[PDB]
Amino acid sequence: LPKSVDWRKKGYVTPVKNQKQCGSAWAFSATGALEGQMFRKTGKLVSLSEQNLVDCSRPQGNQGCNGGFMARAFQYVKENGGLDSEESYPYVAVDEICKYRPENSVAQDTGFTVVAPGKEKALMKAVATVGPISVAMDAGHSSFQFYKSGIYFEPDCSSKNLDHGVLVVGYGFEGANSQNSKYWLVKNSWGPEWGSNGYVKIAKDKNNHCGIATAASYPNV
């Protein structure tokens, strides 16, 4: 595998978004992954609709602004036949009437692939071969809220009890040695003002820190 990967440098990733006061990070993680795969398939980067997922995927197990799961969102896109663009179905950060329109669809999936749970080497293979990957993490910490620079490491982090969906866009290392001071490149949905332009470096191969490889998945397009 490569010593480092950054899909932002290849055109796969949209600008940082902001979920605001709505528990919809699972929807932003899923649109991020679908945006990568649609770009790998077509050459066109198109922002996708988190609101379409928030309002329409209750049957699959999601709860809108009260929580959800990325695999359930990819299940909805498969069963539904499509997903609208952000332009056609804008984000308002509240639960609303499902307004899915097939004529405005710009994405599709046939299902999804799961990364083996707990395996940071399996997550590394998926990021290097596929594109950005949806992942769950434990973000419930003041140290994460106020993150600004450096490789994030928090003793209080759990690898099993998770509460937030994010997007792994790459991995890297500090220094000249590719085998130490490693990190995951993670895109958040708290706006570009949060963190380092909306991103965070999470410690890599430090015993699955904050749960990043516990529940990882990507859409099949």
Binding site: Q19, K20, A139, W190
Partner: peptide
């Protein structure tokens, strides 16, 4: 999780 801005 939420925290926005």
């Amino acid at each position: 999780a939420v925290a926005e801005k």
